């Protein structure tokens, strides 16, 4: 990772966009990356609980527990976080996208969203498998409910849709409720009348 630098002020490129209240979620999600995203949110909200945070998303997903950490921290924090999917937002990364501030969830034109039920693995004795099987079942229902809340769709629809991989174009993601605008071009700064 040969990330570039910018300028008595030396940042790397992601650290400089952090000073502009931009966070990148660009890797698969495991505990380590959840923690560092959570920590950036906590810091940006402490800096100013009223300004918006932009969270750019390019991720294939990851661990439900780490994803929920990011989710719960977005809801908890006072600052509203606008999610923007560039390229790919799948599995837990779709959920994080859908859970931005309503009205400020954006996709670029050729970005995608994909959703599906969780997957995992257990080894152990029958008693041990039974316990973990029950745990994965709760996560499944829990994540279906979180999706239904934030898209507006009836829950038996998300359950049916996520049974296998469900790929959405950005427009299809609009029509599904996962985002609010498909953004193509950056508009001009605008003037206003003071009557």
Positions touching ligand BO2 (CB under 6 A) are 61-65, 90-92, 95, 116-120, 135-136, 139, 143
DSSP character at residue 185: S
In the region spanning residues 169 to 188, those forming contacts with a second copy, defined by CB under 8 A, are 169, 183-186, 188
**15 is an active site residue:** no
| Number of residues lying near a second copy (CB under 8 A) | 97
Q: Write out the two tokens for 120.
A: 């995992």
Buried residues in 24-46 as b, exposed as e (16+ CB within 10 A): bbeebbeeebbeebbebbeebbe
Q: Which does 61 bind (CB under 5 to 8 A by kind): a second copy, ligand BO2, none?
A: ligand BO2
Of 54 and 62, nearer to ligand BO2 (C-beta) is 62
Among 24, 53, 98, 179, binds a second copy (CB under 8 A): 24
Q: Write out the two tokens for 115.
A: 């959703």
Pairwise CA distance, residues 116 & 97, whole Å: 14
**59 is an active site residue:** no
To the nearest whole angstrom, how small is the minimum distance from the Cβ of residue 51 to a second copy? Answer: 14
User: Which of 59, 82, 110, 116 does the annotation list as catalytic?
Assistant: 116
Instruction: Select from 80, 81, 99, 79 the least CA-distant residue to 89.
Output: 99
- The three-point CA angle 45-34-72 to 5° equals 60
Q: Which residue is nearest to ligand BO2 (CB)?
A: 61
Q: Which does 77 bind (CB under 5 to 8 A by kind): ligand BO2, a second copy, none?
A: a second copy
Pairwise CA distance, residues 152 & 161, whole Å: 14
To the nearest whole angstrom, how small is the minimum distance from the Cβ of residue 195 to a second copy? Answer: 29
Q: Assess contact for 150 and 177: CB atoms under 8 A.
A: yes
Taking the CB of residue 130, how many other CB atoms lie within 10 A of it?
A: 12
Among 102, 103, 109, 171, binds a second copy (CB under 8 A): 109
To the nearest whole angstrom, how small is the minimum distance from the Cβ of residue 78 to ligand BO2? Answer: 25
* 69 contributes a contact to a second copy by CB under 8 A: yes
Q: What phi and psi, each to the nearest 5 degrees, are found at residue 54?
A: -95, 130
* 12 contributes a contact to a second copy by CB under 8 A: yes
Catalytically active residues are 91, 116
């Amino acid at each position: 990772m040969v990330i570039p630098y910018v300028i008595e002020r030396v940042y790397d490129i992601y650290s400089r966009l952090l000073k502009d209240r931009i966070i990148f979620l660009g890797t698969p999600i495991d505990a380590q990356v959840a923690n560092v995203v959570v920590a950036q949110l906590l810091f940006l909200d402490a800096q100013n609980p009223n300004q918006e945070i932009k969270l750019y998303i390019n991720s294939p997903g990851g661990e439900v527990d780490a994803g929920l950490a990011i989710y719960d921290t977005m809801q908890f924090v006072r600052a509203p976080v606008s999610t923007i999917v560039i390229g790919m937002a799948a599995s837990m990364a779709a959920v994080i996208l859908a859970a931005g501030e309503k009205g400020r969830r954006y996709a670029l034109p050729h970005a995608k969203v994909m959703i599906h039920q969780p997957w995992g693995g257990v080894r152990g004795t029958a008693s041990d498998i039974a316990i973990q099987a029950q745990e994965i079942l709760k996560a499944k229902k829990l994540l279906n409910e979180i999706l239904a809340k934030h898209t507006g769709q009836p829950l038996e629809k998300v359950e049916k849709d996520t049974d296998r991989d469900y790929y959405l174009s950005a427009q299809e993601a609009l029509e599904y409720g996962l985002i609010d605008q498909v953004v193509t071009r950056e508009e001009a700064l605008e003037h206003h009348h003071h009557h």
